[PDB]
Swiss-Prot record, chain A:
Family (UniProt): Belongs to the HAUS1 family.
Species of provenance: Arabidopsis thaliana
Quaternary structure and interacting proteins, as annotated: Part of the augmin complex composed of 8 subunits. The complex acts on microtubules and interacts with gamma-tubulin in spindles and the phragmoplast. Interacts with AUG3.
Function per UniProt: Involved in microtubules reorganization during spindle and phragmoplast development.
Organism taxonomic ancestry: Eukaryota, Viridiplantae, Streptophyta, Embryophyta, Tracheophyta
Full-protein residues shown: 101 to 149 of 299
Protein name: AUGMIN subunit 1
Encoding gene (name): AUG1
Swiss-Prot record, chain B:
Coiled coil spans: 2-22
Portion of the parent chain present: 266 to 318 of 423
Originating species: Arabidopsis thaliana (Mouse-ear cress)
Similarity section: Belongs to the HAUS4 family.
Consequence of gene disruption: Lethal when homozygous.
Protein name, as recorded: AUGMIN subunit 4
Compartments (UniProt record): Cytoplasm, Cytoskeleton, Spindle; Cytoplasm, Cytoskeleton, Phragmoplast
Subunit structure: Part of the augmin complex composed of 8 subunits. The complex acts on microtubules and interacts with gamma-tubulin in spindles and the phragmoplast.
Organismal lineage: Eukaryota, Viridiplantae, Streptophyta, Embryophyta, Tracheophyta
Role description: Involved in microtubules reorganization during spindle and phragmoplast development.
């Protein structure tokens, strides 16, 4: 009565489709890449050139 | 975010994209002002007329 209600419904909700390529650590993979560079990669050059 | 990488590249050069297009869009419209004056000697107009005078 708790496999689908609790662990399937909470562990896999952020494991199915969402966090495959931006949460590869606890919550930081987005911070240093997505928030970090993927937010800032364009900003790196798109003003200098 | 996956396409933000594309934005980190395509929109990174978005100014570089459009500016090159307009730096290539003037290769033919300016040819009726800039490129006719090279033509103005290449059409033999002045080449024959530097000799005509």
């Amino acid at each position: 009565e708790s496999l689908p209600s609790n662990v399937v419904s909470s562990a896999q909700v952020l494991a199915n489709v969402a966090n495959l390529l931006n949460i590869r650590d606890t919550e930081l993979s987005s911070f240093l890449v997505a928030m970090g560079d993927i937010s800032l990669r364009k900003t790196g050059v798109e003003e200098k050139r | 975010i996956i396409e933000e990488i594309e934005r980190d590249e395509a929109a990174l050069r978005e100014d570089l994209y459009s500016a090159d297009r307009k730096f290539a869009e003037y290769y033919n419209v300016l040819e009726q002002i800039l490129g006719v004056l090279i033509k103005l000697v290449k059409d033999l107009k002045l080449e024959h007329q530097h000799k005509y005078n």
